[PDB]
Amino acid sequence: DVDSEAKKLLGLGQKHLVMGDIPAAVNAFQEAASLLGKKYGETANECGEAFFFYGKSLLELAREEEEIGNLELAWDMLDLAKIIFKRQETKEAQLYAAQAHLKLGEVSVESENYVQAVEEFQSCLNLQEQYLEAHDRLLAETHYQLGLAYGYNSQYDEAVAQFSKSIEVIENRMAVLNEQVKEAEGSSAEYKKEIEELKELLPEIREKIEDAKESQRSGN
Amino acid sequence: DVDSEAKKLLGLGQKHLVMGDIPAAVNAFQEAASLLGKKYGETANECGEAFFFYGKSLLELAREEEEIGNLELAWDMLDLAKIIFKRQETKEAQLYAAQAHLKLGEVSVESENYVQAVEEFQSCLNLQEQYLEAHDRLLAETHYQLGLAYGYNSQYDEAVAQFSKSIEVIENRMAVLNEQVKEAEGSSAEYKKEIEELKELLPEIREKIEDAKESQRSGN
């Protein structure tokens, strides 16, 4: 009924970013976020994934005018999605909440408020650093975003600090990624060798049956 | 003490097959299997891995003479290792017991007794087919060994049957192996792309610090 016709509208807006047709991506999330709100309430867990993407789109859509108008709403939405995500004890529910703070600080940057950006980016880095690997790509992406906000607020000692931490993750990641390429191409070699030898003993088995059924006829 | 000086002798005999110097590989397992027997008994679980390799070597060593003598003992040993393995409820302990029956039937083949070979190979196939994948390489290797014994006993209908089953596994395996090469080289591509893009944003971050510390000096 509702959940059905709404889950349908979510798949659209995401492939509207795939399409890049943002203005229709917004109206895709508009109605979807409206239904779940009118049905389940402004805070029920059902509306987290919805309020997030709807807020996310308004930020992208916003790129003094109606741009300042859309930021105000995009904030309110992501705040809700944050509140909706944070309260649930789930690694997935938390990283979503981290993602709320992330875009929450991106909206702060767009609105020239950098102190808040520093706060929301800090909030998001905090959460991610409980669940994710130290070499996770996201730690790098937030450290950088945070170091940008620090820089906009001309706290260069701390902006340099975050750029360092973001490089420290990016390097330590490519290390893992290289190690994973070795093991990937290494196992690809093991698998390929077995095939190239599995291939070369079916001849033996056929010339075993060739020579077997021939002995069955000869006995007759 | 004993377990220490014996576990040492096991590592030798295995790298004596790596060396291919079988006659010294036998005396490597001889003493090792003797110590654990004299300490723990002719059936204690400690002596399974030992009695197996010692039996395994005597079979290889045996390739009417002292060859017939070594087969008699190689049998007795692998029988024990079988008894020692089978009684333990462990996927690993069972596949070892399957391996006992396997070499147990190989010894039967070498001794011109094919009916027993058929039995011991059948015993081993039975066990493996509980734990292993249907595309496991071992199912193929036993089906073949069994079809050989069936052939030596000129039951060609059943020898052809086993060669078929062994081909059916070997083909269905290369299918998996091919599928695993795809995913291996596929993931190798994902990992390699991330590196080639992780590499190309450290420039951005350095020219972010370059441009950052320069603003710190300019303020001063």
Author numbering:
A (entry chain A), B (entry chain A): 38 to 100, 169 to 325
Original authors' sentences:
NASP is a major histone chaperone for H3–H4 dimers critical for preventing histone degradation. NASP and its homologues share an atypical tetratricopeptide repeat (TPR) domain. They constitute the SHNi-TPR (Sim3-Hif1-NASP interrupted TPR) family, predicted to have four TPR motifs with the TPR2 motif being interrupted by a long acidic region, a capping helix region immediately following the TPR4 motif, and a disordered C-terminal region containing a nuclear localization signal (NLS). Here, we report the crystal structures of the sNASP dimer, the complex of sNASP with an H3 α3 peptide, and the sNASP–H3–H4–ASF1b co-chaperone complex.
To facilitate crystallization, we made a construct containing the TPR domain and capping helix region of human sNASP with the acidic region deleted (a.a 30–340 with a deletion Δ101–159; hereafter referred to as ‘sNASP core’, sNASPc). During gel-filtration purification, sNASPc was shown to have two peaks (conformations) on the chromatogram. The two protomers in the structure are related by a 2-fold symmetric axis with each protomer containing four TPR motifs. The extended α89 is constituted of residues from Tyr261 to Gly324 (64-residues long) of sNASPc with a kink at Glu305, and the kinked α89 helix is totally about 95 Å (65 Å + 30 Å) in length. The α89 and α89′ twist one another in a left-handed manner to form an antiparallel coiled-coil like structure, with the C-terminal one third of α89′of the sNASPc’ protomer further packing against α7 and the N-terminal one third of α89 of the sNASPc protomer, and vice versa. Thus, the C-terminal one third of the α89 and α89′ helices each function like a ‘capping helix’, forming the unique architecture of a domain-swapping and dumbbell-shape dimer. The coiled-coil like interactions between α89 and α89′ constitute of totally 66 residues (33 residues from each helix), of which the predominant interactions are hydrophobic interactions and van der Waals contacts, with a few hydrogen bonds and salt bridges further stabilizing the dimer. Consistent with the extensive interactions, many different mutants with single or even double mutations along the dimer interface failed to disrupt the dimer, and only a mutant with substitutions of six hydrophobic residues by glutamate (V265E I272E L282E V286E I300E L307E; Hereafter referred to as 6E mutant) was found to abolish the dimer formation. The purified sNASPc dimer at a concentration of 5 mg/ml was crystallized in 0.2 M Calcium acetate, 0.1 M HEPES, pH 7.5, 40% v/v PEG 400, with the sitting-drop vapor-diffusion method at 20°C. The concentration of PEG 400 in the mother liquor was high enough to serve as cryoprotectant, thus all crystals were directly flash frozen in liquid nitrogen.
